[PDB]
């Protein structure tokens, strides 16, 4: 019950709508898998706010097979800086291989993303980085 029409109304509060709606579509439309979501956050029950996110899975060649590495997407109206946040949410069967980018908090803080600044930031690359980092050695593994 959240079509493109309703999406606009949900992302109307955002400042960079044209960039927030184009960045998401570009991905979900290219990776034909990422599903758009809308979750509002609160500051210790002191103040709420509308927030959009993207949850889905991304294939990956490993061990001679095609594994799926689930990952979530976070968005902001402008704060703290501007760039969208990244997070991972694997399944109970999967795990979180601690490393340099895949911390124990399902975070994906990458150097390429840390020092990332538009106009090269379209969200399309934000997903590609993981496709490469996870394409060499997926951390979501579960030690079969």
UniProtKB/Swiss-Prot annotation:
Keywords: Acetylation, Cell cycle, Cell division, Coiled coil, Cytoplasm, Cytoskeleton, Endosome, Growth regulation, Host-virus interaction, Membrane, Nucleus, Phosphoprotein, Protein transport, Transport, Ubl conjugation. Residues 1-144 form the UEV domain. It is found in: Cytoplasm; Early endosome membrane; Late endosome membrane; Cytoplasm, Cytoskeleton, Microtubule organizing center, Centrosome. It comes from the Eukaryota. One of its GO terms (cellular component) is early endosome membrane. The modification N-acetylalanine is found at residue 1. GO terms for biological process: autophagosome maturation; cell division; endosome to lysosome transport; exosomal secretion; extracellular transport; keratinocyte differentiation; macroautophagy; membrane fission. Heart, brain, placenta, lung, liver, skeletal, kidney and pancreas. Monoubiquitinated at multiple sites by LRSAM1 and by MGRN1. Ubiquitination inactivates it, possibly by regulating its shuttling between an active membrane-bound protein and an inactive soluble form. Ubiquitination by MGRN1 requires the presence of UBE2D1. One of its GO terms (molecular function) is virion binding. Component of the ESCRT-I complex (endosomal sorting complex required for transport I) which consists of TSG101, VPS28, a VPS37 protein (VPS37A to -D) and MVB12A or MVB12B in a 1:1:1:1 stoichiometry. Interacts with VPS37A, VPS37B and VPS37C. Interacts with DMAP1. Interacts with ubiquitin. Interacts with stathmin, GMCL and AATF. Component of an ESCRT-I complex (endosomal sorting complex required for transport I) which consists of TSG101, VPS28, VPS37A and UBAP1 in a 1:1:1:1 stoichiometry. Interacts with HGS; the interaction mediates the association with the ESCRT-0 complex. Component of the ESCRT-I complex, a regulator of vesicular trafficking process. Binds to ubiquitinated cargo proteins and is required for the sorting of endocytic ubiquitinated cargos into multivesicular bodies (MVBs). Mediates the association between the ESCRT-0 and ESCRT-I complex. Required for completion of cytokinesis; the function requires CEP55. May be involved in cell growth and differentiation. Acts as a negative growth regulator. Involved in the budding of many viruses through an interaction with viral proteins that contain a late-budding motif P-[ST]-A-P. The UEV domain is required for the interaction of the complex with ubiquitin. It also mediates the interaction with PTAP/PSAP motifs of HIV-1 P6 protein and human spumaretrovirus Gag protein. The coiled coil domain may interact with stathmin. Belongs to the ubiquitin-conjugating enzyme family. UEV subfamily. This is Tumor susceptibility gene 101 protein. It comes from Homo sapiens.
């Amino acid at each position: 019950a959240v079509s493109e029409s309703q999406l606009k109304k949900m992302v109307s509060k955002y400042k960079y709508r044209d960039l927030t709606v184009r960045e998401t579509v570009n991905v979900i439309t290219l990776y034909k898998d990422l599903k758009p979501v809308l979750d509002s956050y609160v500051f210790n029950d002191g103040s709420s706010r509308e927030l959009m996110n993207l949850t889905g899975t991304i294939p990956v060649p490993y061990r001679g097979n095609t594994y799926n590495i689930p990952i979530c997407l976070w968005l902001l109206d402008t704060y703290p800086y501007n760039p969208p946040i990244c997070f991972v949410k694997p399944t109970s069967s999967m795990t979180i291989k601690t490393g340099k980018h895949v911390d124990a908090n399902g975070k994906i803080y990458l150097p390429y993303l840390h020092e990332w600044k538009h106009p090269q930031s379209d969200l399309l690359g934000l997903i590609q980085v993981m496709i490469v980092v996870f394409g060499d050695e997926p951390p979501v593994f579960s030690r079969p």
